[PDB]
Ligand binder design. Structure first.
Ligand code: HEM
Ligand SMILES: COc1ccc(C(=O)O)cc1
Ligand SMILES: [Cl-]
Length: 393
């Protein structure tokens, strides 16, 4: 009754062009079984949304990667937020919510915007740049480590650590094995920066540690919560901004609309998140037998959610394969949905908005002018290199 498919959603061929296989996954049925990894899969919007919004049945504390923490040791101590269920999830989540709050955004917005404008001005002096290394990576590197309160030395470990975290949600394929083999120096740096004396006053890290006296978290929970921001807070935005620039480079008509109304910047970024879905997948584990989309799934089963596929499901979206900066994007699952929905989404949206605003005001054209190279990761979708020529307005 449940169709069995041999598609490997973690293979390099799939990463290179996931869209045909994602349609096959959606059209085979609401629930599929992936024989390659012995997991259930849901690729339509309806079932992805339903799974995300039932955390009791589809839990996170047994891991949101392939590995079931009831069967295997986690590769690092579990995240106190991503890999926790309510009620243990609730108070750490509230702390991160307040650390990454509107008031925090108000304190950092002017500096984030100035850094975005400065980066675009700098890139316009060069003309021909790599929109990944020189923009999607360089801009978040110029604002987020400082906003965390990190020292200068050792920041080169941040992107390798995040690549490792996101590869480690995947199955035990070569991408995951190689990441773990190389992990020790990045893990050592990241864990050390999580300690209170190593986080500069006023930054996100110090603010987490300051919350350790309200009864929401204890001092021994603060380092792992800093670790969450150092895991998820940089490489996601690199791939979100890279997605937006890649969309604007491919769809010049949308760049022209954005130039004509720079207040569309925030929605242009949100649409890029839906369109590319830089965070492609997460798993849940069933805590009981459950009926989902007419199919019966037993207890203790891994369920793979295709967030990118849900964001392109024609059952939910009109013209899902078109990039449309005025689309009503509310309800997309690129940041998740429900109790675990991205706690950092205000930081991500701030960065994406101010960068797209800078481009909207300063750049007349974005033309791909070199070979495009894709980056392969078990969870992240994005480019390694995006050579573009920027023409000034
Ligand atoms: C475009 C950028 C980003 C995307 C696409 C993204 C995506 C996601 C998704 C899909 C989830 C849901 C996880 C789940 O349901 O299991 C999530 C959660 C999370 N994100 Fe984001 N994220 C982004 C940026 C950020 C930033 C900038 C931060 C921190 C500064 C951050 C920190 C977190 C944390 C800590 C969680 C776990 C929340 C929880 O479990 O309650 N993310 N993110
Ligand atoms: C969205 O991806 C992540 C990755 C890691 C963490 C974490 O370490 O808590 C949270 C979200
Ligand atoms: Cl670690």
């Amino acid at each position: 009754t449940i169709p069995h498919l041999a598609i490997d959603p973690f293979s390099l061929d799939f990463f290179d062009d996931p869209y045909p296989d994602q349609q096959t996954l959606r059209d085979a049925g609401p629930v599929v079984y992936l024989d390659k990894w012995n997991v259930y899969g849901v690729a339509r919007y309806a079932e992805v949304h339903a799974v995300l919004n039932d955390p009791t049945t589809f839990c996170s504390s047994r891991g949101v990667g392939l590995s079931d923490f009831k069967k295997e040791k986690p590769w690092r101590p579990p995240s106190l937020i991503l890999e926790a269920d309510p009620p243990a999830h609730t108070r750490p989540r509230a702390v991160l919510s307040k650390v990454l709050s509107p008031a925090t955004m108000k304190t950092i917005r002017d500096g984030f915007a100035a850094a975005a404008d400065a980066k675009v001005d700098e890139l316009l002096q060069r003309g021909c740049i790599d929109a990944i290394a020189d923009l999607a990576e360089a801009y978040p590197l110029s604002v987020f480590p400082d906003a965390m309160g990190l020292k200068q030395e050792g920041r080169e470990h941040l992107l390798p650590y995040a690549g490792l975290v996101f590869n480690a949600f995947g199955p035990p394929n070569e991408l995951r094995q190689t990441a773990i083999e190389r992990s020790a120096p990045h893990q050592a740096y990241v864990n050390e920066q999580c300690q209170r004396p190593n986080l500069a006053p006023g930054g996100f890290g110090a603010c987490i540690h300051a919350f350790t006296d309200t009864g929401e978290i204890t001092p021994d929970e603060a380092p792992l919560l800093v670790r969450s921001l150092l895991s998820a807070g940089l490489d996601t935005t690199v791939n979100g901004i890279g997605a937006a620039v890649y969309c604007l480079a491919r769809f010049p008509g949308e760049l022209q609309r954005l130039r004509s109304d720079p207040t569309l910047a925030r929605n242009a970024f949100e649409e890029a998140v839906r369109f590319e879905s830089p965070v492609q997948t997460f798993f849940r584990t069933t805590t009981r037998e459950v009926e989902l989309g007419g199919a019966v799934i037993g207890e203790g089963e891994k369920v793979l959610m295709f967030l990118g596929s849900a964001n392109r499901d024609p059952r939910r979206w009109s013209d899902p394969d078109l990039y449309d900066i005025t689309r009503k994007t509310s309800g997309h699952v690129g940041f998740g949905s429900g109790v675990h929905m991205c706690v950092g989404q205000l930081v991500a949206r701030l960065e994406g908005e101010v960068m797209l605003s800078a481009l909207a005001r300063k750049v007349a054209a974005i033309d791909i002018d070199g070979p495009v190279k894709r980056r392969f990761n078990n969870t992240l979708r994005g480019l390694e290199s995006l050579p573009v020529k920027l023409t000034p307005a």
